[PDB]
Amino acid sequence: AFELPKLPYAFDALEPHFDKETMEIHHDRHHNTYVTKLNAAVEGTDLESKSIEEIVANLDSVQTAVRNNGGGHLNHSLFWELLSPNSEEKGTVVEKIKEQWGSLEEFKKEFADKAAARFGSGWAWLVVNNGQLEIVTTPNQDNPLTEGKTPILGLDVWEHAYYLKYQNKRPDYIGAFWNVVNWEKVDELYNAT
Amino acid sequence: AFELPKLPYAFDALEPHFDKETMEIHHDRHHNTYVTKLNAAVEGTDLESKSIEEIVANLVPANIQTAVRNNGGGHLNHSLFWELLSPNSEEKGTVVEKIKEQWGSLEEFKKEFADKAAARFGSGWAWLVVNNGQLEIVTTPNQDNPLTEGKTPILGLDVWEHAYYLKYQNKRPDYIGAFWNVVNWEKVDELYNAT
Ligand SMILES: [Fe+3]
Numbered sequence: 101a102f103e104l105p106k107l108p109y110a111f112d113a114l115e116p117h118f119d120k121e122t123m124e125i126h127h128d129r130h131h132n133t134y135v136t137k138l139n140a141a142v143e144g145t146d147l148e149s150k151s152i153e154e155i156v157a158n159l160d161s162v163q164t165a166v167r168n169n170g171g172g173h174l175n176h177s178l179f180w181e182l183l184s185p186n187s188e189e190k191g192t193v194v195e196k197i198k199e200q201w202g203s204l205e206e207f208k209k210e211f212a213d214k215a216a217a218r219f220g221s222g223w224a225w226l227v228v229n230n231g232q233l234e235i236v237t238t239p240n241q242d243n244p245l246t247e248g249k250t251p252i253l254g255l256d257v258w259e260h261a262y263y264l265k266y267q268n269k270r271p272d273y274i275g276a277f278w279n280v281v282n283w284e285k286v287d288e289l290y291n292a293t
Numbered sequence: 294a295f296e297l298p299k300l301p302y303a304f305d306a307l308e309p310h311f312d313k314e315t316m317e318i319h320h321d322r323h324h325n326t327y328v329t330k331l332n333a334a335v336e337g338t339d340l341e342s343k344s345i346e347e348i349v350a351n352l353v354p355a356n357i358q359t360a361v362r363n364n365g366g367g368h369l370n371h372s373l374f375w376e377l378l379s380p381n382s383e384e385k386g387t388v389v390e391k392i393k394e395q396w397g398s399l400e401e402f403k404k405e406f407a408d409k410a411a412a413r414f415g416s417g418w419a420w421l422v423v424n425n426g427q428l429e430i431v432t433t434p435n436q437d438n439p440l441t442e443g444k445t446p447i448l449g450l451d452v453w454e455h456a457y458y459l460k461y462q463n464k465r466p467d468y469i470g471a472f473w474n475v476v477n478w479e480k481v482d483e484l485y486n487a488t
């Protein structure tokens with residue numbers, strides 16, 4: 101019942117920040133696969149009519165195919181929407197980041213360092229905890245929603261998100277990322293809280 | 294205090310199974326980074342003067358526990374991993390004989406290994422271990438090592454994506470099949486003797 105969403109841009113639109121070979125394989129193999137495995141593990145169960153957000157909200161935060169693939173699907177679904185070739189650092193969440201970090205660049209430093217420390221596969225997140233902003237990281241395809249915090253910006257730091265172009269150089273990937281953040285979508289997600 | 298091992302063969306010696314550029318980067322970057330960060334963690338501690346096997350079997354102060362579990366694990370696992378690969382893989386010796394006994398054949402051991410190696414979600418390792426006399430196949434997350442839970446690793450496959458992504462991208466099962474063509478069974482046997 102879950103469909104693999106189409107990208108709002110062409111594969112090359114994020115160059116030379118995210119390579120077009122990565123984008124293709126990331127979307128068409130990795131995300132496609134989480135979608136199929138997810139559908140397969142949801143046939144017949146308690147979770148059949150559910151939004152992925154709700155499925156993910158009701159997992160454990162401590163192995164199951166719905167945790168791995170369900171998070172896979174959600175994390176990546178947000179992530180294509182959080183990238184844009186037209187990135188303008190403005191709007192409600194930019195301002196709210198200045199109000200809590202002092203400046204946008206202090207925030208990115210904290211983000212970049214939390215993202216580079218996530219050892220193994222995972223995701224680096226800007227979340228909303230009871231109204232206030234927070235940077236968290238998660239292992240594998242886990243998502244802050246499972247811990248009661250709403251993700252508004254995510255960076256995928258599985259090696260598959262950046263190995264073709266950047267190999268081991270994840271801080272060069274995290275740096276290229278800032279040039280492609282759809283801050284209009286970050287706003288949209290903040291606003292739903 | 295710890296130093297980056299040399300590879301026991303050239304960087305292109307495991308072609309066409311494992312590509313040269315992966316081996317170069319895996320070794321000179323990923324592995325050298327685990328060494329750097331492990332030395333930084335054990336600057337002035339009693340662990341600086343211990344054998345890495347003992348350091349990982351004995352997980353150590355809380356504040357550097359995680360740096361050591363991650364980078365110490367990383368140092369050992371890759372150090373084992375290089376010595377476990379050979380340009381002249383030859384499927385014979387004691388452990389292969391013991392595999393054939395406990396699994397029936399080598400092909401069914403490899404299938405069991407392949408499936409577990411494929412199942413490990415996210416980063417990690419697939420191991421053939423000795424556990425109280427018998428052979429079991431286990432996977433660990435990240436750089437964890439079965440030593441830490443008593444078990445003796447005698448073969449290990451790196452399933453972190455950096456280990457296969459340049460040549461194989463998402464096709465971890467193709468990587469796993471290539472692995473068989475470079476396993477160094479003389480090393481598996483050597484490690485098996487220690488028990
Ligand atoms: Fe991903």
Ligand SMILES: [Fe+3]
Pocket residue numbers: 319323371451453455456
């Ligand atoms: Fe590795």
